[PDB]
Design an enzyme around this catalytic site. Structure first.
Site, PDB file in Angstrom:
ATOM      1  CG  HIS A  64     -44.250 -11.349 -35.829  1.00 35.33           C
ATOM      2  ND1 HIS A  64     -44.364 -12.431 -34.914  1.00 35.33           N
ATOM      3  CD2 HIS A  64     -43.169 -11.775 -37.132  1.00 35.33           C
ATOM      4  CE1 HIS A  64     -42.985 -12.591 -35.005  1.00 35.33           C
ATOM      5  NE2 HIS A  64     -41.771 -12.191 -36.460  1.00 35.33           N
ATOM      6  CG  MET A  99     -38.274 -13.383 -43.200  1.00 32.38           C
ATOM      7  SD  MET A  99     -39.621 -14.384 -42.342  1.00 32.38           S
ATOM      8  CE  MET A  99     -41.095 -13.605 -42.192  1.00 32.38           C
ATOM      9  CB  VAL A 154     -37.606  -2.788 -45.435  1.00 32.11           C
ATOM     10  CG1 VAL A 154     -38.275  -3.478 -46.934  1.00 32.11           C
ATOM     11  CG2 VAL A 154     -37.979  -2.471 -44.293  1.00 32.11           C
ATOM     12  CG  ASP A 214     -57.019 -24.461 -27.599  1.00 26.89           C
ATOM     13  OD1 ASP A 214     -58.026 -24.636 -26.903  1.00 26.89           O
ATOM     14  OD2 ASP A 214     -55.719 -24.450 -26.771  1.00 26.89           O
ATOM     15  CB  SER A 271     -38.975  -9.824 -35.132  1.00 23.31           C
ATOM     16  OG  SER A 271     -38.969 -10.718 -36.093  1.00 23.31           O
ATOM     17  CD  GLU A 304     -38.098  -5.883 -37.054  1.00 27.11           C
ATOM     18  OE1 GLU A 304     -38.190  -5.521 -36.192  1.00 27.11           O
ATOM     19  OE2 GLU A 304     -37.800  -5.916 -38.354  1.00 27.11           O
ATOM     20  CE  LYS A 340     -39.830  -2.375 -39.994  1.00 26.60           C
ATOM     21  NZ  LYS A 340     -40.092  -4.147 -40.629  1.00 26.60           N
ATOM     22  CG  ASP A 384     -34.514  -6.012 -52.524  1.00 30.19           C
ATOM     23  OD1 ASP A 384     -34.491  -5.502 -51.685  1.00 30.19           O
ATOM     24  OD2 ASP A 384     -34.352  -7.297 -52.437  1.00 30.19           O
TER      25      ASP A 384
HETATM   26  O1  LIG Z   1     -37.640  -0.273 -27.295  1.00 31.11           O
HETATM   27  S1  LIG Z   1     -38.602  -1.052 -27.320  1.00 31.11           S
HETATM   28  O2  LIG Z   1     -39.585  -0.302 -27.869  1.00 31.11           O
HETATM   29  O3  LIG Z   1     -38.430   0.052 -25.962  1.00 31.11           O
HETATM   30  C1  LIG Z   1     -38.499  -2.743 -27.166  1.00 31.11           C
HETATM   31  C2  LIG Z   1     -37.731  -2.877 -26.684  1.00 31.11           C
HETATM   32  C3  LIG Z   1     -37.478  -4.878 -26.093  1.00 31.11           C
HETATM   33  C4  LIG Z   1     -38.596  -4.979 -26.833  1.00 31.11           C
HETATM   34  C5  LIG Z   1     -38.594  -6.900 -27.608  1.00 31.11           C
HETATM   35  C6  LIG Z   1     -38.495  -7.257 -26.295  1.00 31.11           C
HETATM   36  C7  LIG Z   1     -38.399  -8.818 -25.795  1.00 31.11           C
HETATM   37  C8  LIG Z   1     -38.391  -9.463 -27.110  1.00 31.11           C
HETATM   38  C9  LIG Z   1     -37.990  -8.971 -28.271  1.00 31.11           C
HETATM   39  C10 LIG Z   1     -38.494  -7.574 -28.300  1.00 31.11           C
HETATM   40  C11 LIG Z   1     -39.037  -5.276 -28.633  1.00 31.11           C
HETATM   41  C12 LIG Z   1     -39.757  -3.458 -28.308  1.00 31.11           C
HETATM   42  O1  LIG Z   2     -37.204 -14.286 -35.021  1.00 34.13           O
HETATM   43  S1  LIG Z   2     -37.359 -13.398 -34.532  1.00 34.13           S
HETATM   44  O2  LIG Z   2     -39.056 -13.152 -34.458  1.00 34.13           O
HETATM   45  O3  LIG Z   2     -36.651 -12.282 -35.333  1.00 34.13           O
HETATM   46  C1  LIG Z   2     -36.390 -12.904 -32.986  1.00 34.13           C
HETATM   47  C2  LIG Z   2     -35.771 -12.552 -33.149  1.00 34.13           C
HETATM   48  C3  LIG Z   2     -35.084 -12.027 -31.348  1.00 34.13           C
HETATM   49  C4  LIG Z   2     -35.731 -12.366 -30.175  1.00 34.13           C
HETATM   50  C5  LIG Z   2     -35.237 -11.515 -28.941  1.00 34.13           C
HETATM   51  C6  LIG Z   2     -33.874 -12.258 -28.565  1.00 34.13           C
HETATM   52  C7  LIG Z   2     -33.334 -11.972 -27.651  1.00 34.13           C
HETATM   53  C8  LIG Z   2     -34.140 -11.711 -26.933  1.00 34.13           C
HETATM   54  C9  LIG Z   2     -34.964 -12.019 -26.716  1.00 34.13           C
HETATM   55  C10 LIG Z   2     -36.202 -11.136 -27.591  1.00 34.13           C
HETATM   56  C11 LIG Z   2     -36.959 -13.520 -30.354  1.00 34.13           C
HETATM   57  C12 LIG Z   2     -37.862 -12.832 -31.779  1.00 34.13           C
END
Ligand SMILES: O=S(=O)(O)c1ccc(-c2ccccc2)cc1
Ligand SMILES: O=S(=O)(O)c1ccc(-c2ccccc2)cc1
Ligand SMILES: O=S(=O)(O)c1ccc(-c2ccccc2)cc1
Ligand SMILES: O=S(=O)(O)c1ccc(-c2ccccc2)cc1
Ligand SMILES: O=S(=O)(O)c1ccc(-c2ccccc2)cc1
Ligand SMILES: O=S(=O)(O)c1ccc(-c2ccccc2)cc1
Ligand SMILES: O=S(=O)(O)c1ccc(-c2ccccc2)cc1
Ligand SMILES: O=S(=O)(O)c1ccc(-c2ccccc2)cc1
Lengths: 402, 733, 402
Positions: free
Chosen positions: B476, B350, B426, B320, B455, B428, B433, B369
């Site tokens: 990412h 980050m 920057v 892989d 993320s 989320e 952005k 920044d």
């Molecule tokens: O607001 S939405 O664009 O519909 C949106 C909703 C959810 C997520 C998401 C899902 C799983 C893990 C991390 C993020 C990302 C975007």
């Molecule tokens: O480490 S991050 O990529 O910032 C990351 C942040 C948040 C989540 C996440 C947490 C709970 C429910 C869905 C998604 C996943 C990844």
């Protein structure tokens, strides 16, 4: 009067000392393999009913230290309540384990007990564990320490066994061990040793020389390596047996027991314990006994021990169908046969340690299981098993076929 | 006895090609030059075994006219690895053939080693695995200090062990503890200078042209100065004493029981069988003679090759990973576009980490920044990493100063002039952005890549804030950027193929592994890691002891337990995502099915414990470090009332992510299972013994069975006992 | 069937590990001295009626190798028929030797047996014999090997025993040991060690610290002398007990058993054997039992073994006048007391191994003889003796004053 029965009696093949197949196999592995074979034979055995695991072991150091019996219980994943104790009564350790297991069952305070022994002499050589009787000069000087081979040569001298006499016995042992293997006598009792991948390591007794001739036996030199090669022990022996002028050194590597690796397991329980677990009793432990004779000649303990077990069970020689005496040295078996007038066709009928080897701690349990099979294969009734011991001891056991 | 695989007649058209060239000088020194014509690398395959068999035979037959041997190579490397395409196919019933093959390999090396003549390895390049084992059978090793050369026994990283004598010989040279810790257990690769320091190599030369002459020179001197011991390894001399003692030595017997316990501590109870097997072969072999020890080594090797974990790891870390590095996900027919100056927006953990790996690879980085005070503390991240690398001696004071000199901290948008690669890191927030990109898109070059490290937020939406959406893309990274090896490249709906390739080529330049993911909610890493923590928070709500939860996470093989990881992800962001997901569902006309973990999140929010960033989560955080589990956690969730078996807890975490990975593959989030496996391993920390969250399904092994059918049976087991989220998709049925 | 009685139960004083008085004394000499004390107490006893000598020994290597029980028989000039066997069931070896001797007499195949143990830990340190469960990484990695000390700390962590709790028990043991010595309780059972010339070597338990105070115990640092100081075992234990977050290391040298040198001998025989040799029975073996628990916590083997020996004897905790559990670690005794609601005034009433020491292979026979003497002194009836063991085993014995 709780009666003790033998339900299973198995053993590994015996690997030789020089370039042996079992040299890469840890002694703990040899015991676990036999535990797995008991499981294969009784997969619905309630191992919680097994209350102790008694293993004989003469050199409990290194791979064999730290209560190897307990290690086998844990490494095989048996219940932690199954216990595990190592004992050492020199060459009789295997049979002393079995007899102790029988006595525990008779007492009513143990129901189902595993017993046997293990000895990997190529990995843990004899004498590895030290000891006062040999290594402390005050005690050595007093007990008149002498290696067993010298006691055996002395037995031949006092009794008049020639070099040809002990060689004639060695040939007989090789022939009867070959006949027993070729006849399939050992097919169900010798459990082949395999590695973690299932590949074969050993399925037969490597020490055997089935092409032994009386002319090749005569070419051998009395060449014991170790304490016997060092000086003084002949003089120490004759200072006690002072009517003997010179010791005739008749024993060689071809008429003395083989140094080998092996293990043996015997399952012993009460009638109720066996019936509760769907087990068929194979034999019944009729009586056990211990005695001994002078430790300088050493290997004469079998005769009072065999005498004592016969009087204890209310039997005589003529009541016994098979006699199984460990072939430590040819002269010991000939001395034993002469004293009790044992018929030749009842003595070590399947060959012994001269051909197949003498894995100290295990031997008593191997030859015990050997007679369980031979009683069943002949439909004979009684068998008497006994071993000489270092330091002048003796152990005997009488079994009855069921 | 025989040096060959077969001792019976085979098909003459099945005879392998010859890979070893023979040359004997007038002094009787034979030079064996390995040159496998089937590839660019000498590899331990069927052809090598037959070729070395013929050569060793000829060495013995001509031993009267031969005074010494030199083992050299004609390739750029010396000898690298084994035939993985053949090893991965070894079934359990093939354990006999595996045992025989490695026994034959070692029988050849043992003859070479006990020839009565000096054997020298002329190591011109990489000597990895079987290559180093060939060298270790020689009496003297000379390496050419050249760029790229590596030495080591990295078999454990594929779930194997050095079965060609690597365990037995390194233990004979260094002793049990040093061989296992320094060489064997982690398959460490050494540069030639370090290799000489630890004893893996005896001499160094500047160029490769000096190797064979230096080898023959050493053979000439050894025969003159040490004629009695020429061609005799230390372990083949009377009076050999193993460094550190044998197992029967009183000193080593004292600490020997702590070796398996320290291993369990390092591996955290994960089911990785290879290190255990190396330790067993190492100790057991030190108790017996060399040949007996070598055969024990072969048995443990065959135990690993025929096992499932080694197949999982060979599939992931060999096949892989090679497919990914070969550009399997990189679009075809795209050229190169070198990068002059990188612009990083944001000096947080980050953005500071992105600037460090970008400047470590040789790029000029502008770190902007909001204030010059913040951007300066961002460059201080690199200064602290270089200072900690100078006191350890891994880099020079010269190269360190040139690294930091490529990082220019600023607070002015005008300093982004001449930037052809932007990496925004920057907060989320979409409109932020949109604002941050709008203030730099005119200052940077026209063909500049506009990358966003996000993320959660979708890339297609973020691209509506720039003019050239063709060059907007998601890049990412993972914290800490200096130690995390994956880059998740996210392709928005307007992202071009040229942009994919330029970020792909960028990721390889900075020494990281890329995957390509289509724009979706949570992409791959975030979405899958969410099912991991949520499965653990649900366990907490159900009443499982927090300590059991963290142990289950560690004993599954994860690098961080799930409650600890939740604090770093910040429970408030988890809630924001849950609110976002519910909003999209309820507005499309549907009904939202909340994950049972959402209640546990809200309870921690209400208790004012949203994670580490605000000082309190499932753990107590004192003095900036973590300080045990919150004692009030057990009363908040009634811990102990539910006591599921540990394996159920472990499986619920592994299966939640495996099932979610299959959904991403079905939906098209991922285009290849290679990306899914390496993405899960390198991105979110899925345990390496599984080979990845996709390999986990096809290679599953449990008490019920093996493979996809057994995975489905166990998933249905978990579903009937814990919730329908464990039911398998139709793609697996 | 045959009832088994205790006729004599004696022991040496326990010499301490550092600058100890018994360090110059071979462990064989400790046993022979006890054999000679038995002869002094019964000059006209026919030693030929003694059929076996069973010595427990945990490290049967070096000065303790080569079947030290047989060495004791020969060196002391005992009849050569008296046998001699060594056994190792770790911490219970002494009591297992007595239990085996008792079960041998019940079976009817032995009349009169010497049982006990010997351990010279200043000369043969724990671990000298090696072992698979520690030095074989395949076995070790799988059985989850953990030293005894961490199991004890884990017990205190789970059951909730604090550092002050275990130190309070340690002070109680020191007090009751000093009270027992001052009151003359040990006057006739502790046999002073003398040299070849009759000069005194040791006549008291020199490990005792009778001026122990709560403040002195609180200053002691947790255990760090052997395998415990090496890393990993804490994590290995918590991988098994995954609901426990942190182990509370409360055990120190002041609340753990002492490393000492010592030996003990017990004469066990049937009613007929004592009547024939003119011996008065001091106590009767009512029942013995063996069980076990998890090998990582290890030291919780006494609770099931005590429950099984009570059920086997048809008794309850209220029918037992004295409880004697070996003080390997304070938390093990406190757990035993909590689980069975043992009254404090019935538990280790004369002190234990924390004050006087724990000479591995001999301890079981020392604390057994301690109870024989205390039942007579108090004119009480029943006593229960049990020991935790390494690996998760357990041995219990009930004796009744006769
Ligand atoms: O607001 S939405 O664009 O519909 C949106 C909703 C959810 C997520 C998401 C899902 C799983 C893990 C991390 C993020 C990302 C975007
Ligand atoms: O480490 S991050 O990529 O910032 C990351 C942040 C948040 C989540 C996440 C947490 C709970 C429910 C869905 C998604 C996943 C990844
Ligand atoms: O069976 S052996 O371990 O070889 C062994 C050998 C010799 C002795 C011995 C010999 C004479 C007087 C005292 C003891 C005891 C045992
Ligand atoms: O019968 S022979 O032609 O001597 C012959 C012997 C052997 C082979 C062979 C060797 C290694 C791998 C595959 C095939 C091929 C032919
Ligand atoms: O683990 S190694 O020693 O590196 C090793 C690697 C590869 C092989 C091999 C694979 C296929 C056909 C023949 C040999 C054998 C050993
Ligand atoms: O039985 S085969 O599938 O032909 C097969 C036989 C052997 C091997 C192998 C050889 C050396 C090291 C690792 C694996 C692999 C496959
Ligand atoms: O050894 S690597 O494959 O380079 C590798 C390096 C790091 C990680 C990782 C570490 C922590 C959290 C998630 C993943 C996984 C694999
Ligand atoms: O009593 S000791 O000999 O110190 C002893 C110490 C430890 C163990 C053991 C512990 C866990 C698993 C297997 C064995 C057994 C005995």
């Amino acid at each position: 009067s709780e009666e003790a029965f033998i339900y299973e009696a198995i053993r590994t093949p015996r690997g030789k000392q020089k370039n042996g197949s079992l040299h890469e196999v840890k002694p703990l592995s040899l015991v676990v393999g036999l535990i797995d074979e008991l499981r294969k034979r009784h997969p619905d055995l309630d191992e919680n009913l097994i209350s102790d695991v008694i293993l004989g072991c003469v050199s409990p150091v290194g791979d064999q230290g730290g209560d190897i019996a307990r290690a086998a219980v844990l490494a095989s994943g048996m219940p932690v309540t199954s216990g595990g104790v190592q004992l050492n009564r020199f060459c009789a350790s295997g049979l002393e384990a079995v007899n102790t297991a029988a006595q525990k069952v008779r007492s009513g305070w143990d129901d189902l007990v595993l017993a046997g022994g293990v000895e990997s002499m190529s990995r843990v050589p004899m004498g590895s564990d030290g000891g006062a009787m040999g290594l402390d000069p005050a005690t050595n000087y007093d007990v008149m320490f002498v290696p067993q081979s010298i006691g055996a040569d002395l037995i031949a001298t006092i009794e008049g066994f020639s070099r040809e006499d002990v060689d004639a016995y060695a040939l007989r042992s090789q022939q009867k061990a070959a006949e027993a293997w070729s006849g399939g006598y050992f097919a169900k009792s010798v459990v082949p040793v395999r590695d973690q991948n299932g590949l074969l390591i050993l399925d037969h007794d490597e020490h055997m020389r089935p092409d032994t001739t009386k002319e090749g036996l005569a070419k051998l030199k009395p060449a014991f390596e170790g304490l016997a090669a060092l000086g003084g022990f002949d003089d120490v022996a004759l200072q006690k047996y002072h009517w003997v002028e010179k010791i005739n050194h008749v024993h060689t590597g071809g008429n003395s027991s083989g140094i080998v690796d092996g293990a043996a397991l015997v399952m012993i329980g009460s009638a109720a314990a066996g019936k509760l677990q769907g087990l068929t009793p194979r034999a019944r432990i009729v009586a056990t006994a211990t005695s001994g004779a002078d430790p300088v000649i050493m290997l004469t303990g079998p005769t009072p021990a065999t005498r004592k077990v016969l009087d204890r069970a209310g039997l005589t020689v003529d009541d016994i169908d098979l006699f199984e005496l460990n072939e430590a040295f040819a002269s010991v078996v000939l001395k034993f046969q002469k004293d009790l007038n044992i018929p030749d066709e009842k003595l070590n009928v399947n060959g012994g340690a001269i051909a197949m080897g003498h894995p100290l701690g295990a031997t008593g349990a191997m030859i015990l299981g050997t007679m369980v099979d031979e009683l069943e294969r002949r439909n004979a009734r009684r068998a008497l098993i006994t071993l000489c011991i270092g330091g002048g001891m003796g152990v005997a056991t009488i079994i009855e076929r069921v | 006895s025989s040096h060959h695989h077969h001792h019976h007649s085979q098909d003459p058209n099945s005879m392998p090609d010859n890979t070893i060239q023979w040359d004997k000088d007038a002094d009787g020194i034979v030079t064996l030059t390995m040159d496998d014509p089937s590839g660019s690398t000498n590899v331990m395959n069927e052809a090598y075994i037959e070729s070395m068999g013929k050569a060793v035979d000829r060495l013995v037959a001509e031993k009267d006219s031969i005074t010494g041997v030199v083992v050299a190579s004609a390739k750029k490397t010396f000898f690298a690895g084994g035939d993985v395409k053949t090893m991965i196919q070894a079934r359990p019933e093939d354990a006999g053939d595996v045992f025989n093959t490695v026994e034959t390999i070692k029988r050849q090396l043992r003859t070479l080693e006990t020839l009565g003549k000096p054997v020298v390895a002329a190591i011109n390049g990489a000597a990895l695995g079987g290559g180093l084992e060939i060298a270790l059978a020689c009496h003297h090793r000379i390496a050419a200090d050249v760029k790229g050369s590596q030495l080591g026994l990295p078999e454990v990283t594929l779930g194997l062990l050095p079965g060609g004598g690597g365990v037995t010989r390194t233990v004979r040279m260094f002793g049990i503890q040093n061989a296992f810790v320094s060489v064997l257990a982690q398959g460490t690769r050494f540069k030639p200078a370090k290799a000489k320091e630890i004893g893996l190599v005896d001499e160094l030369v500047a160029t490769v042209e000096e190797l064979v002459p230096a080898a023959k020179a050493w053979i000439k001197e050894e025969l003159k100065a040490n004629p009695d011991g020429a061609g005799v390894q230390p372990w083949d001399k009377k009076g050999y004493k193993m460094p550190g003692g044998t197992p029967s030595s009183p000193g080593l017997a004292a600490i020997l029981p702590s070796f398996p316990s320290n291993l369990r501590k390092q591996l955290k109870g994960a089911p990785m069988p290879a290190p255990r097997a190396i330790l067993a072969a190492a100790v057991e072999g030190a108790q017996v003679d060399f040949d007996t020890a070598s055969r024990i080594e072969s048995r443990y090797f065959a135990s690993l090759v025929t096992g499932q974990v080694a197949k999982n790891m060979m599939q992931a870390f060999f096949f892989d990973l090679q497919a990914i590095n070969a550009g399997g996900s990189r679009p075809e027919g795209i050229g190169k576009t070198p990068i002059k100056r990188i612009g990083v927006l944001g000096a947080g953990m980050m953005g500071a980490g992105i600037a460090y790996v970008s400047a470590k690879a040789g790029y000029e980085v502008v770190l902007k920044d909001v204030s010059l005070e913040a951007a300066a503390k961002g460059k201080g991240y690199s200064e602290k990493l270089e200072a900690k690398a100078l006191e350890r001696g891994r880099t020079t004071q010269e190269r360190s100063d040139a690294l930091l000199a490529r990082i220019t901290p600023t607070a002015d948008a005008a300093d982004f002039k001449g930037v052809d690669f932007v990496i925004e890191a920057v907060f989320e927030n979409q409109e932020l952005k949109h604002k941050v990109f709008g203030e730099i898109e005119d200052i940077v070059e026209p063909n500049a890549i506009l990358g966003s490290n996000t993320s959660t937020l979708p890339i297609t939406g973020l691209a509506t804030g720039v003019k050239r959406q063709e060059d907007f893309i998601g890049i990412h990274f993972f914290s800490p950027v200096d130690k995390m090896p994956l880059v998740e490249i996210i392709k928005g709906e307007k992202t071009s193929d040229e942009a994919l390739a330029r970020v792909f080529d960028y990721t390889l330049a900075i020494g990281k592994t890329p995957i390509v993911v289509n724009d979706s909610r949570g992409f791959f890493t975030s979405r899958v890691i969410g099912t991991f923590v949520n499965e653990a928070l649900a366990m907490l709500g159900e009443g499982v002891e927090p300590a059991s939860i963290e142990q289950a996470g560690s004993q599954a093989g994860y690098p961080a337990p799930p409650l600890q990881l939740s604090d770093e992800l910040n429970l408030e962001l988890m809630h924001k995502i849950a609110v976002a997901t519910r909003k999209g569902v309820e507005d499309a006309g549907g009904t939202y099915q909340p994950h049972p973990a959402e209640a546990v999140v809200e309870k921690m929010i209400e208790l004012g414990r949203s994670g580490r960033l605000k000082g309190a989560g499932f753990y107590e955080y004192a003095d900036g470090k973590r300080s045990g589990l919150w004692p009030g956690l057990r009363e908040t969730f009634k811990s102990g009332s539910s006591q599921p078996p540990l394996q159920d807890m472990i499986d619920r975490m592994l299966f939640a992510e495996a099932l979610e990975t299959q959904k991403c593959l079905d939906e098209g989030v991922l285009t290849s299972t290679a990306d899914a496996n390496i993405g899960s391993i390198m991105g979110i920390g899925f345990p390496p013994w599984t080979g990845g969250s996709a390999q986990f399904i096809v290679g599953y092994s449990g008490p019920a069975g093996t493979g996809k059918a057994a995975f489905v049976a166990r998933a249905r087991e978990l579903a009937a006992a814990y919730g329908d989220r464990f039911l398998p998709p139709e793609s697996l049925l």
